[PDB]
Structure to design on (748 residues):
């Protein structure tokens, strides 16, 4: 239990242990201890290495709940991301009954958010939101932000370069006390956006920047039968299958369900009500197979994924490393298999091995030992 | 026939007259005459003011076809845009039987492009392509670019800032003679991309930078019957109907098709194979009605749209001006009608009129004269 060295509340440490966390990532070791003191944070870390837990655990530790009073505000760029972030607040405030959280975004009647804000059972101490609706709550005085002590902007580079989101965020930022902690996070903080960020911070802490791999050389007409055989022989907990288009995702998923391989699919061109519903179905282990485009190529963390299959290879090596990264989370065991069915699959597979030193061996025809990836 | 003052081939001028062109836009007046001489061009012009006709008519005038020899190469960033550009070459080479053109992009077997390149009926003098596939044609020597005299990069700022496209484009650019004409076009040429552009030019010519509005105050349950009546009484060529959500787009479009109002819909939550298929169906006048979210609120240019209906009003005035801008393209006649069904429709309609000086009159109960918008 490495997080207990941060000297956090016993309710926090207990919830962190129920979430499977045992070793803090490097961004959390470099940010959490000094963020607890209320120091402003401008943080950059690579995709999926745990920036959410930084400001979630930090604000939850500084929080002392005052009833009916919003103390923490978190801003992101997308509605489902806000829903995801609020669900992380719920899981770490598991054993803090006094804490109440709410999320707000467009697409829902704003009158119901007003009622939820006044109710004594739902009056939130922590508010996650998208800039548009939260501004529509500040300006119609459905919410009071005169007591905010923690102001968080996630994906701050996108929030502050899009100018309609910047106006809303700055309107929200001017309803808060000036003597608050401000924290910003993004995997990409270019030299051109950092000066814009600094106009919200005051002397901030600035942080800047087991997987077995095989390939199979085959033809496109042989992918369906070889994949079905792979899923019958390999012993996996959950598998993610990456495809290069949405049409190939839906058609492959339809053939998997027809062949007694229960699978779901997530991609663009789909209603977000449906994208999230299947995301939760796969995340909560109702089906062991997920076919998706690069919409799940980065960041997604599902601990039961120990098999990633590149049904279609990527154009460049960087996306490949993020794809196979979905398996073997937190240095656990995993297995990655890529299909090489054309000329660029061979040059991109050729360009992956010099970049990372990995010899992506050809999948042996006799198969592999289950112990070598379990 | 203003284009005849450029002193172009009689076959070109004749095809230009069949395309309805009669007056050159300012970008074409400032670029075409000096581009005909083979002078390098770095051109910036606003969206939709005719940059395609600049390099299309210019290369077609300089072209003297040599059989089996590629003389002109055009690079864009998207596959459908390449298909669109090649179709513009077809329409202006209408009366030039010697000219042959081809387009190449991913998603198709590359062996068939090789066969099309060798065939004496299809060996192209002008090649439009996306950087990925054209590089895969140069490096496997399916195409010969040792004779290119005109090299065009459309949307050059996107082609050269994305680095996988820059590598491919520079690999293609090194298979061409160095003493060729190079032309680049984009609506956005920031100060940061122009030095990168100049490394391909040599002393280039550098060019840098009627709507009737009404509203109807009604209730939400009355929108369907009032819209159906509006589409039966008003005389429009094509109509765009803007909705605030994707669920309301699909349900409204389904009711329109049931009531003998053939319509299509484009929005998020949809497979992009399907989004584009309906975009082309509406753009090519197969159905006169399109229901969409703000995915078509900006930029989209369809000349037959003379009626825009705000079935759901926007949150802020800026998006309203872009929405109604889809009708009456290039200063032609148009008609805009917005539904006011709640309190903010009234304050946002209130805030539109001070910003733009327009008195958006209430739609008269007796209807409006067809002459006032035709």
């Amino acid at each position: 239990t490495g997080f207990k060295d941060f000297l956090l509340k016993p309710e926090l440490s207990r919830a962190i242990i129920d979430c499977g966390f045992e070793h803090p990532s490097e961004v959390q070791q470099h940010t959490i201890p000094q963020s607890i003191h209320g120091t402003d944070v401008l943080c950059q870390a690579k995709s999926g290495l745990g920036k959410t837990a930084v400001f979630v655990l930090s604000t939850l530790q500084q929080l002392d709940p005052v009833p009916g009073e919003v103390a923490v505000v978190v801003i992101c760029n997308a509605r489902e991301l806000a829903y995801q972030i609020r669900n992380e607040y719920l899981r770490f405030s598991k054993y803090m009954p006094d804490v109440k959280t709410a999320v707000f975004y467009g697409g829902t009647p704003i009158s119901k958010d007003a009622e939820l804000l006044k109710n004594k059972d739902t009056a939130p101490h922590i508010v996650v939101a998208t800039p548009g609706r939260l501004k529509a709550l500040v300006r119609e005085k459905y919410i009071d932000l005169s007591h905010v002590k923690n102001f968080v902007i996630d994906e701050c580079d996108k929030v502050l370069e899009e100018l309609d989101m910047r106006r809303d965020v700055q309107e929200i930022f001017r309803a808060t006390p000036r003597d608050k902690q401000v924290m910003m996070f993004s995997a990409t903080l270019s030299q051109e956006i950092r000066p814009i960020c600094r106009r919200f911070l005051q002397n901030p802490l600035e942080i800047f920047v087991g997987l077995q791999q095989y390939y199979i050389k085959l033809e496109e007409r042989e992918k369906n039968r070889k994949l079905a055989q792979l899923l019958d022989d390999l012993e996996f907990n959950q598998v993610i299958i990456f495809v290069k288009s949405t049409t190939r995702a839906n058609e492959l998923t339809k053939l998997l369900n027809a062949s007694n391989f229960p699978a779901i699919t997530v991609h663009g061109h789909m209603k977000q009500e449906e994208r999230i519903a299947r995301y939760k179905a796969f995340k909560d282990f109702e089906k062991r197979i997920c076919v998706s485009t690069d919409v799940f190529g980065r960041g997604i963390d599902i601990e039961r994924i120990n098999l990633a299959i590149n049904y279609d290879l990527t154009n460049e090596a960087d996306q490949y490393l993020h794809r196979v990264g979905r398996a073997g989370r937190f240095g656990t065991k995993g297995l990655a298999i890529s299909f090489v069915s054309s000329k660029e699959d061979e040059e991109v597979l050729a360009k992956i091995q010099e970049r990372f030193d990995v010899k992506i061996a050809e999948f042996p025809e006799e198969g592999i030992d289950p112990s070598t990836y379990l």
Q: What stands out?
A: The two ends of chain B are 24 Å apart (CA to CA). Residues 212-374 of chain B form one domain. The interface with chain A takes residues 110, 132, 136, 140, 164, 245-247, 268-275, 315-316 of chain B (CB under 8 Å). The first strand of chain B starts at residue 41 and ends at 44.
